[PDB]
Assembly symmetry: D3
Homo-oligomer: 260 residues x 6
Amino acid sequence: AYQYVNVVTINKVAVIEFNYGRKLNALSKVFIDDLMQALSDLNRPEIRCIILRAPSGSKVFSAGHDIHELPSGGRDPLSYDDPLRQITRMIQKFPKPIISMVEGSVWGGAFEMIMSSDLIIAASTSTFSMTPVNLGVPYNLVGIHNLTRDAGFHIVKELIFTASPITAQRALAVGILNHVVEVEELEDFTLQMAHHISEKAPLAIAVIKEELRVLGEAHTMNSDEFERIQGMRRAVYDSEDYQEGMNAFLEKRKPNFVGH
Amino acid sequence: AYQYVNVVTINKVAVIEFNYGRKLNALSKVFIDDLMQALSDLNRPEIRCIILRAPSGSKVFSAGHDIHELPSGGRDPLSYDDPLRQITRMIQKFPKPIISMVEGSVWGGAFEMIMSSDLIIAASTSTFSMTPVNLGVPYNLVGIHNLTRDAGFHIVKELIFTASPITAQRALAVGILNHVVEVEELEDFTLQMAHHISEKAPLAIAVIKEELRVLGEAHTMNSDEFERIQGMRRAVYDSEDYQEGMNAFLEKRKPNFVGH
Amino acid sequence: AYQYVNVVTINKVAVIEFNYGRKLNALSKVFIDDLMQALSDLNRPEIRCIILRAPSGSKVFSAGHDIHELPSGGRDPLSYDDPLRQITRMIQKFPKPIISMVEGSVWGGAFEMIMSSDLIIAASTSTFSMTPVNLGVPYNLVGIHNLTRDAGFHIVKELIFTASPITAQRALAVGILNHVVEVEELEDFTLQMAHHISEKAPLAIAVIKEELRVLGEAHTMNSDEFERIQGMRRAVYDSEDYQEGMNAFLEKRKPNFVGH
Amino acid sequence: AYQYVNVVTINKVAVIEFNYGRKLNALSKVFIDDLMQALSDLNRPEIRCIILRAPSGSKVFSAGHDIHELPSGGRDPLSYDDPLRQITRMIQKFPKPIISMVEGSVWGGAFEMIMSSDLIIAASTSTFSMTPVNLGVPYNLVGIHNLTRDAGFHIVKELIFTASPITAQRALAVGILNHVVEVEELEDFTLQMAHHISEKAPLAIAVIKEELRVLGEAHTMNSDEFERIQGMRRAVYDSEDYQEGMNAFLEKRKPNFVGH
Amino acid sequence: AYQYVNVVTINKVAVIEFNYGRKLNALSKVFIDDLMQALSDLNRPEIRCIILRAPSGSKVFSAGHDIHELPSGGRDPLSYDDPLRQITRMIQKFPKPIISMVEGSVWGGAFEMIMSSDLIIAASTSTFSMTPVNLGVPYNLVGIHNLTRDAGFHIVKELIFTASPITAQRALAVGILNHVVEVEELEDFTLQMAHHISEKAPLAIAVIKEELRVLGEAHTMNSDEFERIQGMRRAVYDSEDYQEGMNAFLEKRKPNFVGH
Amino acid sequence: AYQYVNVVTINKVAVIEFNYGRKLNALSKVFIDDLMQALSDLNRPEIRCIILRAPSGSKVFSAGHDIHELPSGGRDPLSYDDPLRQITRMIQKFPKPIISMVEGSVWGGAFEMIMSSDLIIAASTSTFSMTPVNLGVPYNLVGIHNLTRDAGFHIVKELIFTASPITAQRALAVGILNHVVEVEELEDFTLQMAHHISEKAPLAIAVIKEELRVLGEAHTMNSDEFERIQGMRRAVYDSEDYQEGMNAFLEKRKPNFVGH
Ligand SMILES: C[C@@H](C(=O)OCCNC(=O)CCNC(=O)[C@H](O)C(C)(C)COP(=O)(O)OP(=O)(O)OC[C@H]1O[C@@H](n2cnc3c(N)ncnc32)[C@H](O)[C@@H]1OP(=O)(O)O)S(=O)(=O)O
Ligand SMILES: C[C@@H](C(=O)OCCNC(=O)CCNC(=O)[C@H](O)C(C)(C)COP(=O)(O)OP(=O)(O)OC[C@H]1O[C@@H](n2cnc3c(N)ncnc32)[C@H](O)[C@@H]1OP(=O)(O)O)S(=O)(=O)O
Ligand SMILES: C[C@@H](C(=O)OCCNC(=O)CCNC(=O)[C@H](O)C(C)(C)COP(=O)(O)OP(=O)(O)OC[C@H]1O[C@@H](n2cnc3c(N)ncnc32)[C@H](O)[C@@H]1OP(=O)(O)O)S(=O)(=O)O
Ligand SMILES: C[C@@H](C(=O)OCCNC(=O)CCNC(=O)[C@H](O)C(C)(C)COP(=O)(O)OP(=O)(O)OC[C@H]1O[C@@H](n2cnc3c(N)ncnc32)[C@H](O)[C@@H]1OP(=O)(O)O)S(=O)(=O)O
Ligand SMILES: C[C@@H](C(=O)OCCNC(=O)CCNC(=O)[C@H](O)C(C)(C)COP(=O)(O)OP(=O)(O)OC[C@H]1O[C@@H](n2cnc3c(N)ncnc32)[C@H](O)[C@@H]1OP(=O)(O)O)S(=O)(=O)O
Ligand SMILES: C[C@@H](C(=O)OCCNC(=O)CCNC(=O)[C@H](O)C(C)(C)COP(=O)(O)OP(=O)(O)OC[C@H]1O[C@@H](n2cnc3c(N)ncnc32)[C@H](O)[C@@H]1OP(=O)(O)O)S(=O)(=O)O
């Protein structure tokens, strides 16, 4: 029923498997629109737990935001109705637990997407990179906030400022992952936990997830502080460095950033 | 001088030992009223540090909220004056450190109670479960907030959505516990730390504890968000699933949750 | 040049080395004024990353606030324009990453200072203590907040209430440090990471750092709560214990705290 | 068409006239559901401005909440999905100006309803009463906040604590009303203002209205403060005085309030 | 029963009359202690409304804070435990309405005290001044907040920056006062209103008063902004101008302020 | 001196007279840069109060934002470093009182500018309008908040949704203006007040002004709410209606708005 995902439901658990490997499951508008439609279709009383996964043996879980669809004009790359911003809101408001079951490497916006989900179970060979400083992208407040609820600030700043991949073992040690398992155990481990969750009280799960959502969002600031930050972000997405980040990716070369 | 607790004072350290083993130290009104009286009586200048403990050899530290005192149908089970809500506020506002020294298994409200205390030192054989989703309970905002200050969101969501016990070793790894020790060393280790804290400046301890309390609570939201969450909670504590959770527990059978 | 720091630039990396070993790099006004001048001088487009370090072989990284410079009594010791409060604001608002490269022991205000920096890389032999309860000091809200973004509340309360040192290995485990390395490798490891960060997009790093700073501060409270805390702090800095803490340190004896 | 309202369109202006005079336009569930449907149906680009009115000559604009439909005992009378709570949210979120055009007396929930609208224009003979203290009702935070954006706190407390009606002339002087007009000029005056607003930029009006709505709601508090207020409200809606207020109103006698 | 106040009970209304004419009802610690004891004594179910008043015929309602009890310099003059701060908190938290009935001139902290009360009814000859800029006093955030809930910002700034007295008629027009009456009618007009309030539901009044209090306080800021303000206040109470303002009053001369 | 302003100092009062009459004191960058420099140059201890005025006899006080300089492409017209946004921040942070002394008509951004100042004294013939809905402009959160601290919400909505001029008498009645005087008395009245203020304690005035500024700004919201509002504002400044409003103004014709 979907071009870019495959859904299998057994009992009360649904697995949403990405079907966009020819583009390394990059978060293009057409891929995200399918993922959201699939989730909306599973918002039914008889579904109690969702798993998100890439196909078995994927080297790349998701290559993150489709760099071709990043606006290189004068507009904000991560506005409120950007597909990545829509799917993280939808995951976080969804009244059922969503488990990210990760095999392969996770990049940029896709790292934010799994951090927005409720649990992350990962193969021992998976790797995680947060990439905006590679491309000159001024990541937005909501998007950065979504990266701060698991690991501490010093770890988050290392991940962002270096853009270096971290292993699953390190991602477990710093609090980003729930569980790391050998890849041959990943599906069996994840289905055991999803089917267990699906026997618990769904209305209690939904209200507790929504309470955590609101508490997690409840770092408040005044209008002047947000407008000041928006001005700073606009100076970045208007920058020569932002154009250079995109151009360098599309030309398959290393960017030369100059601080303008 | 209390029916349900025993208090020992060693210089500047007070040990409050539960005496409600016939009910597995369940957080009944009569038990919590004695605990709160004991704490109030120890709010004196020559006391500097409190330890909360179950008796030596306890299999169960606390079975959590007394399910017989949970209101069935229509009343908020976790309103502001509920005993569990009163004791977590009292622990958090108490101007001396309160150390939970844990032997045995810890369940639901009792897990929130040790999470509200300042330090947790646990036996290597202790276990920890958060149980609302077993019973259909819409846990309240303040109570959920009290579970978010140590382990990250993904870990808290695993504990709540699974209601599965975690070991002391895992609870240490994820940041819930301060120390794990062999049960034979638990009392000596905890008293050594309490005596050490009691040599320090108590007015500085009290103000720093209060600063951490107000900073930990400073996740603010507007009245409409709180009323929306209260409406969601009422729908859960009015639900068939909430009645089925209570009944299933009291009848020792597996609940059948249907999502209304 | 500077009397109390030495600055070296290697390509786009600047290393600020303390030069106040005769006072164990205590945070005196004259030392902090030099550190702040050196940091302000390095806010240039050809500088991409800052390392703060003590001299190679230092037993003591920093002994913390200069206890001679604490007000005698009846005056807030951690007011907004105190040197420690100035340097942490400056580190946090600085538009380049600041890495604390730690060899030796870290005490009190100096622990808050490295916690305010972006990344901490430490020698396997370094140690960390938070000391206000040794001296009777009512640490301020901003200062305490700066200690809560890495490790959990129970961990922070143990560090503050015991004032006991922790090892680099424990500091790694609880989320305070990024990396622990053998002292012989510390400089090479830190420089390699700083050089790596120096090729990334500086405007993206600066706006993301500022987004994290704003989100990290966005725990808000009403005026009454702040004034209530300030009144509690004033009762501490007016106390006999505060005078006894100061006196004991200078006279080189154990304080006798009495709770007034 | 609608059973309980009549809608007329004059170019870009829609007038919604109450048709529930046999029950003095009391805010029963069936009347509010019709009013909300009529508003929803007018959320189309060719409508620019809404007027809410009672029929010409009405002695009673609205008698407020239907006292028969108030939750009888132990149930929150102003929960999130109560009709009065739903209509005020809808009015405030509606992307066109809504003008309350008032002829006759306004009572209780109907006063909060016109206060939630964007402008109020009233007949010189109209009167206004806020009545919960007559019935023993614990008015909810959102509802009280809606009464606080026009007149000062001393004026709102006088209105609520006395439940005394005020004249249109006094309501204008204290800032509740935009305009007071002779009854035979009311309809003409209101329509010329609605037509004038309808010539202005609708997307600008919508975003400015929504900005005012969020700034008006942005009085934020922590969870414990909300739960404490909810507990106090529950003690009121559980009180004998709350029963006495309802019963006295329905039996047409003076209530005897005793303070429990 | 009190040295410095006289209490009369009329049915369910209590009238607390100042008896400190010798010092023009300046808010000395001992006067405020009796006023607070009198309030505490009246916190009984048989009392439904309080009036605060000066004696009949008073030229001065209250000369405001006792200038002789302000500190000489280098100390916060309006700390949390100051008598003016205590009495405004107690009036705002008191579960019965408190009406200020004003005959005579109102100065400084006494103007804040009546503003903290629920309703103000004043004689046509009464006058109102806010005086901190006459004395060089840095008024505190809570205190300034208490002046902003009735008149608009421009009016409040005029009152504070000019320290010029305003008439009762002007105070009515700008929203400070509920009612202005001829002095011969003041006592019976105020009592008629207090008797009317005393017939209403007291639990409903108490919860609505508490809801208004927390909504009024719910302007939230981060710790850094509060500490920044406190630093600015400290510069003022450390200033030569603060000492000049205190000296000029003592010496009965016009202060010469210089901005240091 | 300054091309676009004239400054006269009388004792401790500085009168800043607009000198941009050929564009009716529209807020061009060149005019605002001169006003800000003149204000900065007056930040000296010997200056105690500022008056902002148009030239004596002016029909137009200020024609508002320069519509030729409004980003007429598709970028934010009211971004953080726009001249109107800069001058309102500078007026509000300025440590001396700033009185707007108004003769003539005040439009749009110029209305926000006088609302941001401390006191407004106006000629009886002056008039005031807020005009964004004439041009299709999505006024920003900070700008809208600057209009909400004097009159109530209903009055602000009437001013904005109608864009109709109000008289000085109406502006006084609704709490926008401090005083209205005959045009012949305007200088005498305003200078008498400015000289009176100039006798008072400047450090007390500066800290109380900053306390009001912070309290006035302290309506806080979460990142998601800000980003949602920014998305809505962008849809408006990208609209055909925004282009129509600008074109219509340039072509001296009535705009025809269509809701796209
Ligand atoms: C903006 C946010 C964001 O999420 O940005 C994207 C962040 N993602 C990345 O930076 C990952 C970039 N890609 C890679 O690092 C490598 O391509 C990986 C490791 C994903 C795969 O390497 P592999 O050797 O297996 O195969 P190639 O590199 O040769 O790429 C395969 C094809 O997919 C394109 N591709 C990869 N990622 C992509 C892609 N995110 N978009 C479009 N296109 C792609 C890539 O350009 C190539 O295109 P062609 O077929 O035209 O040669 S933020 O977080 O950074 O702020
Ligand atoms: C609602 C909140 C809360 O805190 O709820 C309570 C959560 N606590 C639990 O769910 C613990 C449930 N109990 C157990 O798991 C086991 O009873 C325990 C493991 C603690 C120990 O098991 P053990 O084999 O030693 O002996 P039994 O299960 O056989 O029970 C012994 C008696 O104690 C009662 N009991 C146990 N816990 C209880 C009890 N929290 N109350 C009343 N009653 C009990 C139980 O109903 C039984 O009663 P009878 O002797 O009358 O048959 S929330 O966090 O979940 O939202
Ligand atoms: C107020 C905040 C704060 O940061 O407070 C300061 C916190 N710092 C400390 O508590 C560290 C206290 N010092 C020590 O633990 C030891 O002195 C150190 C361990 C770092 C190393 O000991 P070591 O054996 O190597 O050599 P000494 O102890 O013999 O001291 C050498 C000289 O340095 C002085 N000293 C050390 N720290 C200091 C010093 N922060 N100031 C002034 N003076 C000192 C100390 O008093 C001695 O002075 P003399 O010249 O009189 O011998 S808070 O965070 O606690 O609230
Ligand atoms: C709970 C909130 C709220 O909104 O509550 C409702 C507040 N409303 C009032 O307090 C209005 C009370 N009513 C009046 O003051 C008078 O009825 C007015 C002036 C509205 C109408 O005067 P009039 O002489 O024309 O005719 P009656 O009093 O003779 O009543 C006509 C019929 O309408 C019923 N009625 C009036 N208001 C009502 C009614 N809000 N509900 C049901 N029923 C009614 C009342 O019970 C009577 O019914 P019967 O025909 O059975 O005798 S809160 O804000 O107070 O918290
Ligand atoms: C600091 C805060 C505050 O509330 O400060 C106090 C604000 N109040 C004032 O500034 C009012 C100051 N007083 C006056 O303006 C006049 O004294 C009054 C007008 C109120 C009445 O004048 P009158 O001519 O009738 O008779 P006197 O001036 O002769 O004063 C009678 C005695 O009362 C003392 N007095 C007046 N107000 C006072 C007094 N607030 N304290 C102590 N003492 C006094 C004053 O010093 C004098 O003392 P001796 O008998 O020793 O001469 S803040 O809000 O300003 O920031
Ligand atoms: C975006 C914000 C804002 O402030 O927008 C602007 C709001 N302002 C207005 O709507 C006022 C527009 N101006 C007028 O309506 C009229 O000019 C008034 C009534 C003020 C005065 O009319 P009058 O016939 O006496 O003499 P002119 O129209 O001839 O103007 C004199 C010179 O200044 C220019 N001017 C006037 N207002 C202006 C001007 N806001 N810009 C540029 N330029 C101007 C105008 O175009 C003319 O220049 P030229 O001599 O080159 O033709 S918001 O608040 O609306 O959102």
